[PDB]
Design a protein around this ligand. Structure first.
Ligand SMILES: CCCCCCCCCCCCCCCCCC(=O)OC[C@H](COP(=O)([O-])OCC(O)COP(=O)([O-])OC[C@@H](COC(=O)CCCCCCCCCCCCCCCCC)OC(=O)CCCCCCCCCCCCCCCCC)OC(=O)CCCCCCCCCCCCCCCCC
Ligand SMILES: CCCCCCCCCCCCCCCCCC(=O)OC[C@H](COP(=O)(O)OCCN)OC(=O)CCCCCCCCCCCCCCCCC
Ligand SMILES: CCCCCCCCCCCCCCCCCC(=O)OC[C@H](COP(=O)(O)OCCN)OC(=O)CCCCCCCCCCCCCCCCC
Ligand SMILES: NC(=O)C1=CN([C@@H]2O[C@H](COP(=O)(O)OP(=O)(O)OC[C@H]3O[C@@H](n4cnc5c(N)ncnc54)[C@H](OP(=O)(O)O)[C@@H]3O)[C@@H](O)[C@H]2O)C=CC1
Ligand SMILES: CCCCCCCCCCCC(=O)OC[C@H](COP(=O)(O)OCC[N+](C)(C)C)OC(=O)CCCCCCCCCCC
Ligand SMILES: CCCCCCCCCCCC(=O)OC[C@H](COP(=O)(O)OCC[N+](C)(C)C)OC(=O)CCCCCCCCCCC
Ligand SMILES: CCCCCCCCCCCC(=O)OC[C@H](COP(=O)(O)OCC[N+](C)(C)C)OC(=O)CCCCCCCCCCC
Ligand SMILES: CCCCCCCCCCCC(=O)OC[C@H](COP(=O)(O)OCC[N+](C)(C)C)OC(=O)CCCCCCCCCCC
Ligand SMILES: CCCCCCCCCCCC(=O)OC[C@H](COP(=O)(O)OCC[N+](C)(C)C)OC(=O)CCCCCCCCCCC
Ligand SMILES: CCCCCCCCCCCC(=O)OC[C@H](COP(=O)(O)OCC[N+](C)(C)C)OC(=O)CCCCCCCCCCC
Ligand SMILES: CCCCCCCCCCCC(=O)OC[C@H](COP(=O)(O)OCC[N+](C)(C)C)OC(=O)CCCCCCCCCCC
Ligand SMILES: CCCCCCCCCCCC(=O)OC[C@H](COP(=O)(O)OCC[N+](C)(C)C)OC(=O)CCCCCCCCCCC
Ligand code: SF4
Lengths: 50, 353, 48, 175, 55, 69, 359, 161
């Protein structure tokens, strides 16, 4: 008889790690990539059609 | 505006990451306290907190807010230095010790080949924070838990330090990220199972958790050092004990259960093939997955912190100091002369690739 | 009848002696399992 | 000087909410009181047979912890004093000292007939005829001993009173 | 010299915490059992006709 | 009596608003046959669920929402 | 205190009420009276309520601070101390505070003003409305409390409203209303001995040059007891004070040695001298920034005024009580803020006075 | 130990009264003389373990106390201070169906003791807290008048039953 009410805090602690990790993996990757696109801000932001 | 606001974000982006990091740790710590009572409640046929917020979700909120709005008891009105300084050292050390834990490959605030030393050094500052709480007090119960507190943390620090160094010896690196990646083909719980029991036993003592509970023993020394703590000094010191629980549970996952590595490489591969690597949606899923593997491994040990508390009677202090010196330390030095021998015999001395 | 009484044939016997049967393998087998895991573990460490 | 003092301003527990700053201070009151109601940490001051029923409230069947009630062994960490048992003359000065050491806000519950008014030992040479001769008592739980549900009804009644407090709206209006 | 257990058996139980791991396991059995708690004041414990309460 | 199946079945039988009230004061999602209502307005149910534990086969639904006496 | 607060067990009031006391004067005894202490949750009210309830006199305590009144009940037996919620902007409540009473006491007053009440509304408006309602409620005796320098011509707002407050009472209740003008009352947790012990006293030299006469808060409480229970004190004005003259600058320094507090008093901020135009400015700002009663502008003017004794009024010898000197009571009220413990008797304290003034 | 307390006053007064309880009354006082003994040790053994550190075994047993206090209340009307045993016998007869509840509790209660002996009897931490602690010699126990279990622990086989 698995108690789901007992495991509610763990599913929230699982989300705590995922929240921090999901942000760090994506935000740092996006920033590194964007600054590696060109030497000015009008290049970094926009994506060319070609 | 739209061009003079984007650069505002790019000038504030790395502060939002840190706040998301701090919130990530505090959410785990806040809901660790509930999970401790919810779990230990169901092993005692109770229910645990389920009345403060739907199913007790807002239980840490109420306890923290209740104590944050209590009257702080200072020996004299302007003695805020004495009450706060003890817990403040403890909180900063364990919050700074979170700076080396990676949630994925490279996703840690501090990355340096001396991460393991930084982690052991930071913890020893917290030890200094703990003994200071009682050492500025005349209460007999509070000042009782300094000489016994000091040696208990001193004695099991050698055991915890040596175990970390044996794992660092097997990979020949004092970097947290290198240790995790070194466990791809094997998890160090299989070769070094005895060290994991020794690591977990030592981890309990360092956080003063039961059965190594003699510092803050309610039946013995009431609240220990906290019998003179109330309102904010109680929460900050209480928060520190649970930041360490989350940390030391994560450290056991890192050193013996592969850290953020997947339980199955196939399931990891199949899940990620549903997302395109050219869109930022792929990297959110990987970060959620990689922290998910760590979270599940870490949760199992935060579970075991509570689980052992509900199953083992408290261990007597005099028999507690002799345990780490006359039993654990010889074993830990025996292995540290054993692992280099096996590695050399098969020409397998480690190098940092 | 008109009082609280046990049945005619009485109640069935209950369990009151100690019931703690031991569980798990022999202690030697656990030690063999430990030295198998240690041996295999250092095989995989030495391989990598 | 000049004082234009009205006569029709309702007393604080009756005053309806009119402007926005009433709700702002009311919300700060509800959030503050909700936390104090939910983190109802008493102090383990069991003295006699009334304490046995106090422990049974924490037993699995009733499980006071499920409501956020954790018995604390120190006044510093406690805000509720539960007098569970007979208050003798010899114990009386200690009870006052323990009471004075509790930081505000604090509430006291009197459980059972001994604490309430002496009870069976009302005509004894060594029993205080009611703990309300030593400390202020916020609610009286009747019984010998009060059942576990009777004690929980007393705790529930006090929480309803704590949620009715207006500590901060009082400053904005009564002060 | 009259201990039936061999040296290794006594030390495997000692080093691997034989009875403690069992003690944990029995506690974990309770985790998958129905608790006892009743949700007063929405439910009440049993009462009998002989009960003494308010006069 | 603690499994999420027991909470799922009771959640569906009551519907949202009845179950949301129990998720606010009762802390548990239960469903039972209605037995009667008293002079104050409280309604008293009886639980037929074969898994419900010994002392939890009867309960009340108080008239108020945020408070119960 | 003693064992019986009365001189006789039958006491007839101005209204023909015959009150017969029963018992020996302990907790279970009664006096037949029924007082109403306004502001009984205040500093002076707690001592006054305690003495009345200690001897079985029913006391109605109107309150506004719900928690601050709880500790009042310990002083009286069952049914003795009664609580009536009230607000001076509500009339019905005050007309119920005095409905069944036989004595009305008015300790309500302020030296600070707030966003909801000014000093004019409290020292004058409240006392007037109390006396008007206490008269229409058939109360035999009213006792009022004002400041020690009640003078409607004072430039200070506190003594401006306190002086006018005396008139509007006798102009409302009548020529029977007693009046009490206590000196600065010192006691445990007293507002007077507090600012003398407060460490970071900003503008110390500006504030502590004011000279007063110390007086025991208990004697003021016991004096109010004798006044209510005696009908020969109706319409009389009492000026309650001590004999020996003390200056706050003397006290703030005599206290300093008892506290035992070299470099530290200067570094810790014990001395914080201040130009007066700044103090008038900072105390000006905290009137609308601080949410708590801070040392305000009007209190600053009082520091320029020493205590005045209105010699046409009465003293403790009228009550047959010897006034208590601060010499014998200063020490026991600083032990909370305080080898061998250093105990100061009357001789020790007087010698300590000599050292402060000696250069 | 509420009912055994009032059993020693009943025995003393009946002894002075030269009276003897009828047969059924004596069985009821033995039946509730042992229910009370189980109630006491559940309170004593398990709170003793709680001081030593074992929090959980306390909670398991105190649900048995709730189940046993139900028998106290069903016969007398009070969970704790049942004035049931009196000089001359007991207050009232047993209610119908009480025997069938004492039995149904008795079938299961044996397993409740085993789960207590699981966490404590063989635990090395429990045996470190107790073995060699508070030793009493038989000569010392008889001199200080130690009785009950703190006299049979010292090896003397004496029992007042
Ligand atoms: C694990 C997977 C089990 C499973 O999937 O099925 C059962 C499980 C539900 O259990 P159940 O409905 O009580 O089983 C039917 C009877 O009620 C079950 O009632 P029962 O009391 O008769 O069950 C008896 C069964 C225990 O019941 C079980 O089957 C659990 C066994 C799993 C053990 C490992 C976990 O056996 C035991 O009591 C002994 C097991 C304990 C031995 C030691 C633990 C082994 C490790 O199904 C689910 O996975 C869904 C619920 C799980 C929680 C999901 C949500 C978590 C909270 C998130 C917020 C919402
Ligand atoms: C007796 C021990 C026998 C060791 C096993 C040797 C072995 O299996 O060789 C595999 C590998 C090297 O062999 P290889 O050159 O690849 O030849 C082709 C094999 N198909 O070997 C390796 O690369 C590494 C082998 C590591 C062996 C570790 C032995 C166990 C460690 C000590 C256990 C202590 C238990 C107490
Ligand atoms: C992760 C790190 C690695 C973890 C795994 C570590 C594995 C290594 C473990 C070290 C010990 C392994 C060897 C164990 C067997 C040797 C000990 C032994 O045989 O027993 C002790 C023996 C006495 O024999 P005994 O058992 O007392 O006989 C009683 C009969 N009723 O004593 C004797 O008489 C001879 C003792 C043997 C001499 C060499 C030692
Ligand atoms: N050393 C001293 O204390 C001296 C004081 N006095 C005067 O004696 C009088 C009594 O003051 P004291 O007891 O000593 O100390 P406090 O200043 O604390 O007493 C003030 C009393 O008046 C009440 N009060 C003020 N404003 C209101 C209001 N709007 N509505 C209802 N009640 C109000 C207060 O109620 P609440 O507590 O709930 O706020 C309090 O009970 C004062 O007028 C004071 O100026 C004169 C000489 C010496
Ligand atoms: C966590 C996320 C869900 C919140 C839980 C909740 O909404 O909690 C419900 C709260 C707490 O009051 P309670 O009496 O414990 O209600 C719980 C019901 N029980 C007794 C069955 C357990 O009440 C309310 O609905 C009133 C306030 C509305 C929400 C206020 C927001 C609080 C900010 C932080 C959370 C967003
Ligand atoms: C206890 C957990 C131990 C564990 O999971 O290991 C037990 C074993 C060995 O697997 P391993 O070498 O630890 O797995 C690490 C390699 N990965 C990355 C594929 C997971 O698992 C089985 O083959 C079953
Ligand atoms: C895997 C898994 O179930 O992850 C799902 C997660 C968390 O799982 P959990 O069962 O709370 O992990 C805790 C495991 N213990 C029991 C070892 C502590 O919850 C959700 O995301 C919903
Ligand atoms: C993050 C959230 C922090 C606050 C969460 C709980 C606030 C609460 O519980 O606030 C309770 C309040 C007040 O109650 P009310 O019904 O207005 O009381 C007075 C009844 N009148 C209206 C008839 C006078 O309710 C609200 O409408 C809150 C809205 C603001 C948010
Ligand atoms: C495998 C990884 C998980 C377990 C790790 C720890 C192993 C402990 C046992 C070895 C020590 C020892 O001494 O083992 C031997 C002992 C004692 O045997 P005995 O009393 O002589 O048996 C009597 C005679 N027989 C052999 C005929 C029966 O057996 C045990 O107590 C087994 C305990 C099993 C339950 C605990 C495991 C579950 C814990 C949580 C897992 C998630
Ligand atoms: C070679 C393989 C290496 C394996 C390394 C592992 C060793 C671990 C310790 C074994 C020694 C021992 O348990 O010792 C017991 C010691 C000291 O006992 P003592 O004073 O010597 O008396 C007994 C021995 N006599 C009679 C021979 C002298 O105290 C204890 O009860 C410590 C119990 C700690 C339990 C903490 C909880 C566990 C949490 C982790 C699981 C969830
Ligand atoms: C930095 C800090 C972060 C925030 C901290 C969180 C604090 C927890 C919240 C306390 C809740 C509480 O107390 O909810 C319960 C309390 C007390 O209800 P009562 O005593 O019965 O009176 C209230 C009921 N009446 C007056 C009608 C009798 O109010 C309530 O019923 C609030 C009812 C309206 C809620 C509207 C919420 C609007 C949405 C908010 C989210 C989107
Ligand atoms: C952040 C905003 C701080 C406002 C505090 C304030 O404005 O407080 C100061 C004033 C004065 O009133 P008081 O504090 O009762 O005066 C007593 C203190 N004395 C004696 C020093 C004067 O208050 C008000 O007019 C509050 C109106 C509502 C403001 C918004 C909330
Ligand atoms: S009131 Fe009754 S149950 Fe409570 S302590 Fe007194 S005698 Fe015991």
């Amino acid at each position: 008889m698995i108690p789901f009410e007992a495991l509610i805090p763990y599913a929230i602690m699982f989300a705590g790690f995922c929240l921090g990790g999901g942000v760090m993996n994506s935000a740092i990757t996006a920033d590194i990539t964007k600054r590696a696109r060109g030497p000015n801000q009008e290049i970094k932001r926009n994506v060319g059609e070609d | 505006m739209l061009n003079n606001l984007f650069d505002f974000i790019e000038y504030i982006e790395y502060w939002l990451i840190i706040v998301a990091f701090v919130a990530s740790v505090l959410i785990v710590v806040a809901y660790l306290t509930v999970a401790e009572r919810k779990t230990m409640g169901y092993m005692q046929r109770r229910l645990g907190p389920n009345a403060v917020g739907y199913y007790g979700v807002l239980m840490a909120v109420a306890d923290a807010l209740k104590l944050l709005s209590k009257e702080i008891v200072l020996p004299h009105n302007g003695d805020i230095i004495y009450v706060m300084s003890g817990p403040l050292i403890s909180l900063f050390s364990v919050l700074l010790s979170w700076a080396v834990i990676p949630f994925g490959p490279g996703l840690s605030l501090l990355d340096s080949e001396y991460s393991i030393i930084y982690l052991l050094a930071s913890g020893s500052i917290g030890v200094f924070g703990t003994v200071i709480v009682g050492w500025m007090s005349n209460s007999k119960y509070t000042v009782l838990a300094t000489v016994r507190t000091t040696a208990q943390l001193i004695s099991y620090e050698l055991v915890l330090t040596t175990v970390v160094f044996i794992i660092a010896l097997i990979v020949s690196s004092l970097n947290i990220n290198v240790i995790i990646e070194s466990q791809y083909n094997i998890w160090y719980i299989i070769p070094f199972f005895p060290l994991c029991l020794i690591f977990f036993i030592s981890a309990l003592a360092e956080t003063a958790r039961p059965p190594f509970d003699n510092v803050e023993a309610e039946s013995e020394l009431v609240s220990g050092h906290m019998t003179e703590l109330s309102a904010s000094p109680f929460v900050i010191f209480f928060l520190s004990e649970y930041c360490s629980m989350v940390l030391m549970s994560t450290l056991t996952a890192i050193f013996f259960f592969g850290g953020y590595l997947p339980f199955s490489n196939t399931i990891h591969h199949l899940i990620l093939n549903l997302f395109d690597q050219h869109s930022i949606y792929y990297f959110i899923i990987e970060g959620i997955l990689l922290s998910g593997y760590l979270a599940i491994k870490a949760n199992f040990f935060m579970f075991s912190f509570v689980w052992i508390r509900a199953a083992a009677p408290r261990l007597r202090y005099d028999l507690l100091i002799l345990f780490c010196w006359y039993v654990l330390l010889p074993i830990v030095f025996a292995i540290v002369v054993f692992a280099p021998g096996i590695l050399y015999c098969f020409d397998a001395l480690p190098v940092i690739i | 009848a008109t009082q609280d009484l046990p049945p005619i044939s009485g109640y069935a016997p209950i369990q009151w002696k100690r019931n703690l049967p031991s569980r798990g393998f022999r202690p030697v087998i656990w030690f063999l399992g430990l030295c198998t895991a240690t041996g295999y573990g250092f095989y995989q460490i030495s391989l990598a | 000087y000049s004082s234009d003092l009205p006569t029709d301003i309702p007393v604080l527990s009756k005053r309806p909410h009119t402007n926005l700053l009433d709700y702002t201070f009311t919300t700060f009151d509800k959030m503050k009181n909700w936390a104090r109601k939910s983190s109802f940490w008493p102090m383990t001051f069991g003295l006699a047979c009334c304490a046995v029923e106090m422990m049974h409230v924490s037993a699995p069947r009733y499980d006071q912890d499920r409501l956020g009630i954790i018995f604390r062994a120190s006044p510093r960490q406690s805000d509720i004093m539960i007098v569970a048992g007979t208050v003798t003359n010899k114990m009386a000065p200690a009870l006052r000292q323990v009471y004075d050491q509790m930081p505000y806000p604090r509430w006291v519950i009197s459980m059972g007939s001994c604490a309430n008014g002496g009870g069976y030992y009302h005509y004894s040479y060594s029993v205080v005829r009611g703990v309300d001769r030593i400390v202020p008592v916020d609610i009286y739980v009747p019984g010998c001993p009060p059942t576990s549900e009777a004690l929980m009804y007393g705790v529930f009644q006090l929480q309803k009173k704590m949620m009715d407090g207006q500590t901060h709206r009082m400053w904005y209006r009564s002060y | 010299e009259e201990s039936s257990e061999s040296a290794l058996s006594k030390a495997t139980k000692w080093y691997l915490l034989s009875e403690i791991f069992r003690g944990l396991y029995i506690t974990l059995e309770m985790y998958f059992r129905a608790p006892y708690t009743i949700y007063y004041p929405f439910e009440k414990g049993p009462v009998s006709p002989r009960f003494r309460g308010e006069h | 009596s603690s499994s999420i199946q027991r909470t799922l079945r009771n959640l569906w039988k009551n519907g949202f608003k009845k179950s949301f009230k129990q998720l606010q004061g009762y802390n548990d999602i239960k469903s039972g046959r209605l037995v009667g209502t008293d002079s104050f307005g409280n309604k008293f149910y009886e639980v037929d669920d074969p898994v419900e534990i010994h002392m939890r086969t009867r309960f009340v639904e108080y008239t108020g929402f945020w408070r119960q006496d | 205190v003693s064992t019986f607060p009365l001189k006789s067990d039958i006491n007839i009031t101005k209204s023909g009420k015959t009150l017969l006391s029963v018992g020996q004067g302990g907790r279970s005894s009664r006096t037949g009276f029924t007082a109403t202490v306004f502001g009984g949750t205040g500093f002076l009210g707690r001592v006054v309520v305690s003495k009345l309830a200690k001897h079985g006199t029913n006391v109605v305590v109107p309150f506004r601070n719900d928690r601050a009144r709880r500790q009042l009940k310990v002083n009286g037996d069952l049914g003795v101390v009664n609580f009536v919620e009230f607000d001076i902007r509500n009339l019905k409540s005050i007309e119920d505070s005095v409905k069944y009473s036989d004595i009305v006491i008015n300790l309500i007053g302020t030296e600070h003003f707030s966003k909801n009440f000014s000093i004019e509304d409290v020292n004058i408006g409240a006392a007037e409305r109390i006396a008007k309602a206490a008269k229409e409620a058939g109360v035999s005796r009213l006792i009022h409390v004002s400041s020690y320098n009640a003078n409607p011509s004072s430039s200070s707002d506190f003594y401006a409203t306190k002086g006018i407050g005396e008139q509007v009472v006798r102009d409302n209740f009548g020529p029977d209303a007693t009046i009490v003008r206590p000196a600065p009352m010192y006691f445990r947790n007293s507002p007077f001995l507090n600012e003398l012990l407060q460490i970071k006293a900003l503008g110390g030299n500006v504030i502590f040059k004011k000279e007063v006469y110390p007086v025991h808060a208990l004697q003021v409480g016991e004096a109010i007891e004798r006044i209510a229970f005696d009908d020969a004190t109706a319409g009389q004005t009492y000026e309650l004070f001590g004999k020996e003259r003390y200056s706050k600058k003397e006290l703030r320094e005599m206290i300093k040695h008892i506290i035992h507090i070299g470099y530290y008093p200067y570094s810790a901020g014990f001395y914080l001298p201040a130009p007066e135009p700044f103090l008038y400015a900072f105390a000006l700002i905290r009137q609308y920034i601080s949410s708590q009663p801070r040392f305000n502008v009007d209190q600053l003017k009082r520091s320029h005024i020493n205590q005045e004794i209105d010699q046409s009024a009465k003293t403790f010898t009228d009550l047959g009580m010897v006034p208590d000197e601060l010499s014998e009571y200063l020490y026991r009220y600083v032990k909370p803020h305080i080898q061998n413990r250093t105990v100061y008797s009357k001789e020790d304290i007087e010698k300590l006075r000599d050292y402060v003034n000696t250069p | 130990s509420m009912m055994t307390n009032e059993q020693v006053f009943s025995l003393a007064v009946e002894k002075l009264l030269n009276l003897e309880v009828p047969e059924r009354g004596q069985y009821i006082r033995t039946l509730f003389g042992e229910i009370t003994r189980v109630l006491n040790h559940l309170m004593s053994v398990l709170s003793h373990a709680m001081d030593v550190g074992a929090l959980t075994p306390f909670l398991w047993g105190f649900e048995e106390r709730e189940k046993l206090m139900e028998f106290y209340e069903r016969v007398s009307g009070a969970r704790l201070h049942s004035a049931y045993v009196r000089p001359g016998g007991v207050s009232q007869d047993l209610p119908a169906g009480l025997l069938d509840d004492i039995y149904m509790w008795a079938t299961q209660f044996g397993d409740r003791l085993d789960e207590t002996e699981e966490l404590l009897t063989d635990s090395r931490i429990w045996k470190q807290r107790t073995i060699g602690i508070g030793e009493v010699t038989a000569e010392d126990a008889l001199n200080y008048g130690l009785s009950g279990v703190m006299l049979r622990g010292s090896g003397v086989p004496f029992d007042i039953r």
